[PDB]
């Protein structure tokens, strides 16, 4: 259409509020203060196309997975109301994170004010996905001890709310604070080491490993470290500047690690629920 016509631009001609990764040299959407143009640009090739579609499809995927989870037969759970509330809190974190994410990457080039608003929501979305993932996990892991389950539910909320507060600060979004952001969200996920050591000290080395938690938690910690490393160091576009403008740059690979990391976490807590249903809902040990 003849309306809202635009061409991609090199990094140098971008305004300051859009210059976030100097290794993406060309292919940028120019500043365009039209929500019509920004939403139409989802169907165009530019630095943000992959960022947008990884989390747009990932967002409808967790929404479909969450609806199907809610309509699962109550007969396949031990406590279907509380089990669906803890899984639902995880889905709410995943859907909100992916929604705030693709919305931000879509309306990013609109204006300085709009980009500030959605970057604050984007950041907050990562804290909600991390806090929400702890909820079904603490639930099944401390199924018999309610006091440590509730203490850890408090901790991850206090820390998560502190990440949402710091991710509101204007300096936090500057390119120099990239490794601060990577450390803040990394610390939040890796704070699961505390209830993990508590769980293996209490339950046993054999008991934690046999029930697959140790291997599955090492995988999660790998995706956390590997995901934060790519994001913070801008690999691979740091090594091939100008070659990764459209495909497989750091932020794009990171977006893939978020939807994958949320899927291996879901698969993990979904097995924990299958195990709880196999053994029933009491304590004999």
């Amino acid at each position, epitope marked *: 259409e*003849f309306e*809202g*016509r*635009w*061409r991609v*631009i090199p990094h140098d001609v971008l305004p300051d509020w859009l210059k976030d990764n100097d290794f993406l040299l060309h292919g940028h959407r*120019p500043p365009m*203060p039209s929500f019509r*143009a920004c939403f139409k640009s989802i169907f165009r090739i530019h630095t943000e196309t992959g960022n947008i579609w990884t989390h747009l499809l990932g967002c409808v995927f967790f929404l479909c997975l969450g609806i199907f989870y809610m309509f699962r037969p109550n007969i396949s759970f031990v406590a279907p109301l509380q089990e669906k509330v803890v899984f639902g809190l995880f889905f709410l974190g995943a859907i909100l994170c992916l929604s705030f994410s693709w919305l931000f990457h879509t309306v990013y080039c609109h204006s300085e004010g709009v980009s500030r608003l959605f970057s604050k929501l984007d950041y907050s979305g990562i804290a909600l996905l991390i806090m929400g993932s702890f909820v079904p996990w603490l639930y099944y892991s401390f199924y018999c001890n309610p006091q440590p389950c509730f203490i850890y539910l408090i901790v991850i909320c206090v820390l998560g709310i502190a990440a949402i507060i710091v991710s509101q600060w204007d300096m936090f979004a500057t390119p120099q604070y990239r490794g601060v952001r990577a450390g803040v969200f990394l610390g939040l996920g890796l704070s699961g080491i505390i209830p993990t050591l508590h769980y293996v000290i209490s339950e046993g080395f054999l008991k934690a490993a046999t029930i697959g938690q140790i291997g599955w938690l090492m995988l999660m910690a790998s995706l956390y470290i590997t995901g934060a490393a790519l994001y913070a160091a801008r690999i691979p576009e740091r090594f091939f500047p100008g070659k990764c403008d459209i495909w497989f740059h750091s932020h794009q690979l990171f977006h893939i690690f978020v939807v994958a990391g949320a899927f291996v976490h879901f698969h993990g807590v979904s097995n924990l629920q299958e195990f709880r249903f196999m053994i029933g809902g009491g304590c004999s040990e």
Partner: antibody, heavy 118, light 108 residues
Framework: EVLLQQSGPELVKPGASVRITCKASGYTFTDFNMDWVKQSPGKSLEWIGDFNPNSGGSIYNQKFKDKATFTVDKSSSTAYMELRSLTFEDTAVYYC???????????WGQGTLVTVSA | SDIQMTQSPASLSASVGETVTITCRASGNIHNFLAWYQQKQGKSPQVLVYNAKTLADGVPSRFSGSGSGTQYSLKINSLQPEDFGSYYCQQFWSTPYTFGGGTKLEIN
């Protein structure tokens, strides 16, 4: 610094044709659309059309479709506009103006005055 | 010849230090894809404000763009002697791109 440098003035007979040169420097020529603008004496500005040097595509304002033709010489970083079958109404200053993603014009040529005189 | 740009006033004269406001009205919504230009006598135009409110590189803070939809404005705070010239609005939302008729600003 970016600079758009146009060719000198033309004093031509009616029915003649002119080619306005627009040498573009200080940037990667193919990165931005170049637009042509007319300003009749003591008048406002009229968008003639835009030209894409990378794709080679042009979009003309219907008013000037049969009058203006945009060409390019990518190797020399220059935009061209040929004006056909000149008339007294074509006495105007013609500008090349450069886009930056969208069609707002940060950079402009000094203008070429074309005078159609008999 | 689709979007008509209506500039107002057509001309005005104010003294140095005063504030002026030039308004632009589009015949259709231009989604903030509006730019303002200042043009000096015998010289080529120069961009002041683009994307309705974004102040261009090198332009003084005295110039401010404002507006939305079909009604946009250019405000010149504290007029300076060098502010004399022709002012033009422009829409780049739909082809063909169009300009306002201009505003001649005289400085007393």
């Amino acid at each position: 610094e970016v600079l758009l440098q146009q060719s000198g003035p033309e004093l031509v007979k009616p029915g003649a044709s002119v080619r306005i040169t627009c040498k573009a420097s200080g940037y990667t020529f193919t990165d931005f659309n170049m637009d042509w603008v007319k300003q009749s004496p003591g008048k406002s500005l009229e968008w003639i059309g835009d030209f894409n040097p990378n794709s080679g595509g042009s979009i003309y304002n219907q008013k000037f479709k049969d009058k203006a033709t945009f060409t390019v010489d990518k190797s020399s970083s220059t935009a061209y506009m040929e004006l056909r079958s000149l008339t007294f109404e074509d006495t105007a200053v013609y500008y090349c103006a450069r886009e930056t993603g969208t069609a707002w014009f940060a950079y402009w040529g000094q203008g070429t005055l074309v005078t159609v005189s008999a | 010849s689709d979007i008509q740009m209506t500039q107002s006033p057509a001309s005005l004269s104010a003294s140095v230090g005063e504030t002026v406001t030039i308004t632009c009205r589009a015949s259709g919504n231009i989604h903030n894809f509006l730019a303002w230009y200042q043009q000096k006598q015998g010289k080529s135009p120069q961009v002041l404000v683009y994307n309705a409110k974004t102040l261009a590189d090198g332009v003084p803070s005295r110039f401010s763009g404002s507006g939305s939809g079909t009604q946009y404005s250019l405000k010149i705070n504290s007029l300076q002697p060098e502010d004399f010239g022709s002012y033009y609005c422009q829409q780049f939302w739909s082809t063909p791109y169009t300009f306002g008729g201009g505003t001649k600003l005289e400085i007393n």
